[PDB]
Design a protein around this nucleic acid. Structure first.
Ligand SMILES: [K+]
Ligand SMILES: [K+]
Ligand SMILES: [K+]
Ligand SMILES: [K+]
Ligand SMILES: [K+]
Ligand SMILES: [K+]
Ligand SMILES: [K+]
Ligand SMILES: [K+]
Ligand SMILES: [K+]
Ligand SMILES: [Mg+2]
Ligand SMILES: [Mg+2]
Ligand SMILES: [Mg+2]
Ligand SMILES: [Mg+2]
Ligand SMILES: [Mg+2]
Ligand SMILES: [Mg+2]
Ligand SMILES: [Mg+2]
Ligand SMILES: [Mg+2]
Ligand SMILES: [Mg+2]
Ligand SMILES: [Mg+2]
Ligand SMILES: [Mg+2]
Ligand SMILES: [Mg+2]
Ligand SMILES: [Mg+2]
Ligand SMILES: [Mg+2]
Ligand SMILES: [Mg+2]
Lengths: 63, 183, 52, 141
RNA sequence: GUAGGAUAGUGGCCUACCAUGGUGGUGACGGGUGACGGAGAAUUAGGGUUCGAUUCCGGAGAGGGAGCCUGAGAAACGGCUACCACAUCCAAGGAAGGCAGCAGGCGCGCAAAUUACCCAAUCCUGACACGGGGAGGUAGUGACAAUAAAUAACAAUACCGGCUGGUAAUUGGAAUGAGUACAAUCUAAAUCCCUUAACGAGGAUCCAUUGGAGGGCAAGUCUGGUGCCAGCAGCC
């Protein structure tokens, strides 16, 4: 106790930070907003849309 | 493939070949009581380490004196023993390694050193202190009685800076009693 | 000409044995303290250990 | 005397190979007969209790050892399994499900019980040890 | 062996003709394997014995065969075609199948986990710095196996043995983590660990268990019950 160790980065500018840093780190620093999504739902929607051809494919995945 | 599977592990002790030797039991109990060990497993682990070291020393001694492998490994082993305090400077030959006993290794335990330097009234008291985090080797708090103290680190043993016996902030019992007596 | 043995006799002695309650005794220390007690009993303080 | 020719390695190897069969343990482990036995090379087997039996103890002892006739589920073979501990036969009933283990001597009789090579470990999914010590209760159904 | 066909190519790989050759107690051929092979695992005077399904390398398979398109690369099966065995739907006219992938279910058995989260790490792939990846990682269950390590420490009093030691559900204050929880930290986001405000111990009920006490083999010629019975007993 009483001591800690970590890693630190200091970018020349916020633009460089945004261009090179991970999205999760940017969200941690507040420069980005987390988007709520579910990978299983995305996979199911993609599979559902796979069976529909044309413009209607866009709403096919909703179901 | 699971990457965790590639991590390796090994045993540290063996059970006695004959479970119920009376003389062996008496000697083991004597050593355990003298050094405040919780069970025979710790003594058997120390014996396993000593046997490994002695076997390595014997294997090296079988080789020719001018053998580069013998020279290198013997120098390494002697340096290790000197670092951990098992052997003194005058004991600068591999033969003195074979004259090492379990007591020599047990004397290097942090519990034994804490008891010897006078920070504890008894070996059991020392064990309780180390497991209760009242002891630090250098600037690091150590709570493992089996901790093997090196010669350089022997003189740095001191009470933990965040403990009642090393600094301020007394224990919860003392604080509760003070609060009760405040009225 | 007797009743030496049969299947109906199972549990005879166990059922016949009178039931005696277990005495309430203070727990012994565990681990290091237990070994300390054993060492003190067998070496420091002091026929077999359970002799009469 | 032994053959000692430097070129007699084949003869020595073949003689040892032939003579290994005189060893009972080697023959037991290499004849492939373990699969025809009731357990078929397993440590334990489940079975159904067919009937309670009493086996007379061998001389010079005199007693009625309690056993059960058990039919193994996986192959239908019928065996006799001893029921250890006092009054433990009372926890066994006809058509019960019992786990059966070896008697400790690797397919041979133990003690004064003749022709018994198995013992009961569990009945109705509950250990006979637990039933004897009253730690658990035999399921009603 | 000669000459051809086929193949990406050599070759009885196949065709026509020709010759009678080829292997074998130095074990051919045939049979068994609860037989994938190796790197390796267990035990270690030496020599040896046993194991190797499983994360690395090589091979084979995708219910059993056979055939084939595409493609640089497949005799591919999360590609197609036919038969065989199973098998879902039907409006009875037809139509669709392949978990020895990740979960999960039935069966089988002595015998083995969640129908979770994520591409943040490692790397692969595509037109591609950006998408995707049940590969892989995180977390859940997990006493396979392995490591460290709590269940008490110290004084006063009384008993004992020689100031020195042991015992006491007698007294006294000190110490602390198991637990609990702000907070921070961790984390792709969580959780765990580490750190740490306020709590958390006297029969410290915060109560250690598994086997044994005739010998092998450490430990009772103690007390009650039973009386070759019940039972114990690896062997005696
Ligand atoms: K008899
Ligand atoms: K007898
Ligand atoms: K060719
Ligand atoms: K030819
Ligand atoms: K193979
Ligand atoms: K291509
Ligand atoms: K599956
Ligand atoms: K990735
Ligand atoms: K014994
Ligand atoms: Mg040709
Ligand atoms: Mg096979
Ligand atoms: Mg293999
Ligand atoms: Mg597997
Ligand atoms: Mg492979
Ligand atoms: Mg294939
Ligand atoms: Mg299948
Ligand atoms: Mg098929
Ligand atoms: Mg195929
Ligand atoms: Mg595939
Ligand atoms: Mg499949
Ligand atoms: Mg299991
Ligand atoms: Mg373990
Ligand atoms: Mg406890
Ligand atoms: Mg003895």
């Amino acid at each position: 106790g009483g001591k800690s160790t970590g890693f630190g980065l200091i970018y020349d500018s916020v633009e460089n930070a945004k261009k090179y840093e991970p999205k999760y780190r940017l969200i941690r620093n507040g420069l980005d907003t987390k988007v709520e999504k579910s990978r299983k739902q995305m996979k199911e929607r993609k599979n559902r849309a796979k069976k529909v051809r044309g413009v209607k494919k866009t709403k096919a995945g909703d179901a | 493939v699971h990457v965790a599977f590639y991590r390796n592990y090994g045993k540290t002790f063996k059970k006695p070949r004959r479970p119920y030797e009376k003389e062996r039991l008496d000697a083991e109990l004597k050593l355990v009581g003298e050094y405040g060990l919780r069970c025979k497993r710790e003594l058997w682990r120390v014996q396993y380490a000593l046997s490994r070291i002695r076997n390595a020393a014997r294997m090296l001694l079988t080789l020719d004196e001018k053998d580069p492998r013998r020279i290198f490994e013997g120098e390494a082993l002697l340096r290790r023993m000197n670092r951990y305090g098992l052997l003194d400077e005058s004991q600068n030959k591999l033969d003195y390694v074979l004259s090492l006993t379990v007591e020599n290794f047990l004397e290097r335990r942090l519990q034994t050193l804490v008891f010897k330097t006078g920070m504890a009234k008894s070996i059991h008291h020392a064990r309780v202190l180390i497991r209760q985090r009242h002891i630090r080797v250098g600037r690091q708090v150590v709570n493992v009685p089996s901790f093997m103290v090196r010669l350089d680190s022997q003189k740095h043993i001191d009470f933990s800076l965040i403990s009642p016996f090393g600094g301020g902030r007394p224990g919860r019992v003392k604080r509760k009693n003070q609060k009760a007596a405040a009225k | 000409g007797k009743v030496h043995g049969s299947l109906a006799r199972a549990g005879k002695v166990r059922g016949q044995t009178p039931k005696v309650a277990k005495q309430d005794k203070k727990k012994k220390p565990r681990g290091r303290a237990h070994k300390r007690m054993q060492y003190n009993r067998r070496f420091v303080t002091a026929r077999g250990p359970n002799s009469s | 005397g032994k053959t000692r020719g430097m070129g007699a390695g084949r003869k020595l190897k073949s003689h040892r190979r032939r003579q290994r069969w005189a060893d009972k343990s080697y023959k037991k482990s290499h004849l492939g007969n373990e699969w025809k036995k009731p357990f078929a090379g397993s440590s334990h087997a489940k079975g159904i209790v067919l009937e309670k039996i009493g086996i007379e103890a061998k001389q010079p002892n005199s007693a009625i050892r309690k056993c059960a006739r058990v039919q193994l589920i996986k192959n239908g073979k019928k065996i006799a399994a001893f029921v250890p501990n006092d009054g433990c036969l009372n926890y066994i009933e006809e058509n019960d499900e019992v786990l059966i283990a070896g008697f400790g001597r690797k397919g041979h009789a133990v003690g004064d019980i003749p022709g018994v090579r198995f013992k009961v470990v569990k009945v109705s999914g509950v250990s006979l040890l637990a039933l004897f010590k009253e730690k658990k209760e035999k399921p009603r159904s």
